[PDB]
Amino acid sequence: IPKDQWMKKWWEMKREIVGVVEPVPHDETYCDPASLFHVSNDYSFIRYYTRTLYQFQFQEALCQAAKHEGPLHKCDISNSTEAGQKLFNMLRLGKSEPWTLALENVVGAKNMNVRPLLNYFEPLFTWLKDQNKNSFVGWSTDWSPYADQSIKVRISLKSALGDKAYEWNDNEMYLFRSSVAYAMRQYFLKVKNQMILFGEEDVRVANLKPRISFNFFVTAPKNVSDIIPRTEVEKAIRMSRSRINDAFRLNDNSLEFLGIQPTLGPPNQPP
Amino acid sequence: FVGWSTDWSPYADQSIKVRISLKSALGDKAYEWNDNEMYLFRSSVAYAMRQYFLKVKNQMILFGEEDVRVANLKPRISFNFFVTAPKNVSDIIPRTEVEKAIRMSRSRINDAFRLNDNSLEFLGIQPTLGPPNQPP
Amino acid sequence: MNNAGDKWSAFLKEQSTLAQMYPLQEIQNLTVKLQLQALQQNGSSVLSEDKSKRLNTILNTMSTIYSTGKVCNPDNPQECLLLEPGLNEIMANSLDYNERLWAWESWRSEVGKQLRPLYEEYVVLKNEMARANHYEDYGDYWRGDYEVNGVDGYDYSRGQLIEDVEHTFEEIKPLYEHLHAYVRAKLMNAYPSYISPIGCLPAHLLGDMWGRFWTNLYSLTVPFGQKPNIDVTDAMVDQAWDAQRIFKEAEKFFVSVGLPNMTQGFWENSMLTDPGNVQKAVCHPTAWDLGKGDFRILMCTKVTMDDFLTAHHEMGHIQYDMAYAAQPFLLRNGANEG
Ligand SMILES: *[C@@H]1O[C@H](CO)[C@@H](O[C@@H]2O[C@H](CO)[C@@H](O[C@@H]3O[C@H](CO[C@H]4O[C@H](CO[C@H]5O[C@H](CO)[C@@H](O)[C@H](O)[C@@H]5O)[C@@H](O)[C@H](O[C@H]5O[C@H](CO)[C@@H](O)[C@H](O)[C@@H]5O)[C@@H]4O)[C@@H](O)[C@H](O[C@H]4O[C@H](CO)[C@@H](O)[C@H](O)[C@@H]4O)[C@@H]3O)[C@H](O)[C@H]2NC(C)=O)[C@H](O)[C@H]1NC(C)=O
Ligand SMILES: *[C@@H]1O[C@H](CO)[C@@H](O[C@@H]2O[C@H](CO)[C@@H](O[C@@H]3O[C@H](CO[C@H]4O[C@H](CO[C@H]5O[C@H](CO)[C@@H](O)[C@H](O)[C@@H]5O)[C@@H](O)[C@H](O[C@H]5O[C@H](CO)[C@@H](O)[C@H](O)[C@@H]5O)[C@@H]4O)[C@@H](O)[C@H](O[C@H]4O[C@H](CO)[C@@H](O)[C@H](O)[C@@H]4O)[C@@H]3O)[C@H](O)[C@H]2NC(C)=O)[C@H](O)[C@H]1NC(C)=O
Ligand SMILES: *[C@@H]1O[C@H](CO)[C@@H](O[C@@H]2O[C@H](CO)[C@@H](O)[C@H](O)[C@H]2NC(C)=O)[C@H](O)[C@H]1NC(C)=O
Ligand SMILES: *[C@@H]1O[C@H](CO)[C@@H](O)[C@H](O)[C@H]1NC(C)=O
Ligand SMILES: *[C@@H]1O[C@H](CO)[C@@H](O)[C@H](O)[C@H]1NC(C)=O
Ligand SMILES: *[C@H]1O[C@H](CO)[C@@H](O)[C@H](O)[C@H]1NC(C)=O
Ligand SMILES: *[C@H]1O[C@H](CO)[C@@H](O)[C@H](O)[C@H]1NC(C)=O
């Protein structure tokens, strides 16, 4: 992971592994994982994962020596000397032997297994499956609470220009972001009388596709957590749409903002 | 000559002067040249530099609106700009490369401001009209 | 305590240098080789003096920044909320979307920004330290705690942990998806027009600051709220259960499975009850294995079912520590960290 792509990766992992999406966008200036105690104090965190499995691997094992018949969550290993001796055979071992051998002395396996956890939670898993008949299981890596403020742009270069059409590389994206920032500056200067220093880094762009159709949203100048509401962005685009069209030699049909529909103009009539 | 001038500098030989006449090319319906127009012009110049360095020298240089330094702004809208290194201000791009970059992407700069090659004069970059093709 | 810890650390460091006289290429005794591995790891002693002091400085700075992190009102900077008091209560009790979002964002903007530049240098320094000890990366050094070699069947490589964890997580995903769907459906009725039925959950609506635990969401996701949970806290009060007999009950439970009794000096040296205000002590339940058959428990035990379970948990640690008392001091620890 490059040093300038930590957070973008982190919130890309939470959206598809944990299924948790950030409420507001975070740039590279944030260090969200460092806000956790175990990250900022140099503690290995994989220990809390394996320990979650081992106990069940122990428990499901200890209920076999205790001769448990019902569900695993109702098991009690008390009054069972065989289970205690089986546990003690590994307890007395300490570090003198590899942990795999210690596991094989209780669970009979050399590698960590996750099946005991599923066996433990099966009575809950069946109920949850029965409780989600009409709801949608899973999640999508494309939705976010701030996606309601995004404006989608669709560009068709080879239709408005035909031949002699430039290619949409990163430089064209920089020019487009600069044009959007200029439009925001013009709107905030000519309407609200507020001098806001927008830049090309304050127009955040995602979901770039070969169609040249992306989603951009304009944030605060240095307060990325703050997003300009979509209504003001639409008003700004309407105010200075001709300049944006001229900057790319497009005319109101190959540069569609998908929510900002242009007005053709009244057909003036004779008397 | 006794004395000195507050307008000369050793790096002033790398400066490119831009002269803009809004009310002649557009007449009426002409926007005013405030700071936002200057930001747009600097962004266009940075885009032109990026295009030149990508399509010729095969070098990816991340220019920005802060790397096109502008001085001597006047009500005529005539200033002097020079393009520096992305984060090495002490380093100035030589004027020849800047002129080549402007020549390469002058149409885009003209379109961004609705000017046509006569109200946007770069004072050193003269455009070419085009050969008058002849019948047999 | 600082002097004792420094003397112990100096002794360990000077013995680590002496342990270099016996390379692993010739040791044939399994436990001797393992003890040599335990005492041979240079750790932070392999870096230069400047790098070591910089690493210690940045670690201490990060720890202090996390500890002293306070969210303050710009209107009145004098009043601030700390992490443990208040802010955790805000994240675990409030049902207001805006308040939870403010708490989450303020905590992750006041502490994370101050920790990003320090963490960037911490990563590089740890990578350099790991590479100085013939490790590809510091994460590999972390994973080395599960390394097993030269057993002919029980061997475990450091790179095997990653693939094993990845394989195991894909078998939990089917259950986690259903649990997440149920949690989202139940939260839909508590925070309307914010939880999409098709997307994920916002990070600030998981009952806790970081989402590490969903326990505080239980009140918002109880399956059958009309049926009370199994609670026996009042029953112990009716029978007058002090914090002296619950440990006896735990001991009886332990001995019911064949595990040995408690030590004679364990009860006398223990602090099973809070010393009040006259004596200042800690309250985190901890087990202590001082050595020479000295096992003790520190716990400000109240009269609660959770206290009973915590007492059982601590007695578990005590029993585990007692089990390997005959092992050499370097091997007086669990098989691994979990
Ligand atoms: C970058 O941008 C971000 C935004 O993206 C910005 O962060 C915001 O900063 C502001 C200012 O500090 C925060 O607003 C503060 O909120 C504090 C928390 O208490 C309130 O939290 C909720 C806020 O809702 C407000 O608006 C709604 C709708 O208008 C209104 O109903 C609320 O009353 C409130 O005004 C709110 O839900 C919450 O509600 C309480 O009461 C209900 C009962 O009504 C109860 O059910 C709840 O459980 C809860 O107890 C509560 O009102 C708040 O303390 C704070 O107010 C103090 O400070 C201001 C000055 O800051 C004083 O004027 C005021 O008198 C108080 O002393 C203030 O309201 C906002 O939450 C942040 N948002 C985010 C997302 O972070 C950053 O500052 C920007 N940074 C930079 C550098 O620019
Ligand atoms: C941001 O941009 C700035 C530029 O704006 C940049 O700063 C430059 O960095 C370079 C690289 O370090 C500097 O060049 C170094 O100069 C050192 C000084 O010794 C030399 O100084 C003069 C340099 O002239 C060079 O070019 C001319 C013309 O091409 C040529 O004739 C010279 O020989 C030389 O190559 C030079 O006049 C001077 O001359 C000596 O000898 C004559 C006799 O011939 C004698 O009369 C003089 O008195 C003098 O003794 C001398 O040659 C130099 O040490 C250094 O060379 C070492 O380092 C490079 C690598 O850096 C090795 O490759 C090399 O083998 C040597 O080990 C190098 O030549 C340049 O001067 C800087 N300019 C400015 C304005 O600062 C920043 O680095 C940029 N920063 C970032 C972050 O990007
Ligand atoms: C590895 O060395 C240990 C320590 O010497 C051996 O364990 C026994 O330890 C006791 C106490 O130190 C000694 O009195 C014994 O002589 C040691 N050996 C035996 C067989 O009891 C251990 O046996 C050695 N391992 C091997 C494979 O030789
Ligand atoms: C520890 O460092 C010393 C030098 O300081 C080096 O000789 C040795 O190989 C390193 N590793 C071990 C395991 O001793
Ligand atoms: C453990 O000790 C208590 C008294 O300290 C004693 O009553 C009890 O019988 C002992 N346990 C066993 C199994 O004998
Ligand atoms: C279209 O109509 C809108 C308002 O109805 C107006 O602002 C805009 O200038 C019009 N565009 C034309 C006439 O080209
Ligand atoms: C003018 O001529 C130059 C080279 O002589 C050429 O690059 C440029 O495209 C021409 N411009 C026209 C024909 O508009």
Author numbering:
A (entry chain A): 468 to 738
B (entry chain B): 603 to 738
C (entry chain A): 62 to 399
What does the paper say about this structure?
Several plasma membrane transporters import proline into the cell, including the Sodium/imino-acid transporter 1 (SIT1) encoded by the SLC6A20 gene. SIT1 belongs to the SLC6 gene family of amino acid and amine transporters, and the larger Neurotransmitter Sodium Symporter (NSS) superfamily. SIT1 adopts the classic LeuT-fold expected for this family of amino acid transporters, while ACE2 is composed of peptidase (PD) domain and collectrin-like domain with transmembrane and neck regions. As with the homologous ACE2-B0AT1 complex, the structure is a dimer of heterodimers where homodimerization of ACE2 is mediated primarily by its neck domain while the ACE2 and transporter subunits interact via three distinct sets of contacts.
We therefore determined the ACE2-SIT1 structure, with an open-conformation peptidase domain, in the presence of glycine to a resolution of 3.46 Å overall and 3.76 Å for the transporter alone. The maps were sufficiently detailed to model and refine residues 11–582 of SIT1 and 20–768 of ACE2. This SIT1 structure agrees well with the recently published ACE2-SIT1 structures in complex with receptor binding domains from SARS-CoV2 and determined in amino acid-free buffers (RMSD = 0.765–0.940). This movement between open and closed conformations occurs as a 30° rigid-body rotation around a hinge at residues 612-617 in the loop between peptidase and collectrin-like domains. Further, the branched N-glycan chain at ACE2’s Asn690 is rigid and well-ordered in the open conformation, hydrogen bonding with asparagine, aspartate, and glutamate side chains on the peptidase domain’s H6 and beta-hairpin between H4 and H5. Accordingly, the glycan density is weaker in this conformation as the chain becomes more mobile. This suggests that the Asn690 glycan chain acts as a latch on the peptidase domain, stabilizing the open conformation and thereby regulating its change between conformations. Without a secondary amino acid substrate, SIT1 has undergone structural rearrangements that open the transporter’s cytoplasmic gate. The greatest movement is a rigid body 17° tilt of TM1a. Within the SIT1 map determined in glycine, there is no apparent density for amino acid or chloride, though the binding site is similarly resolved to the pipecolate bound structure.
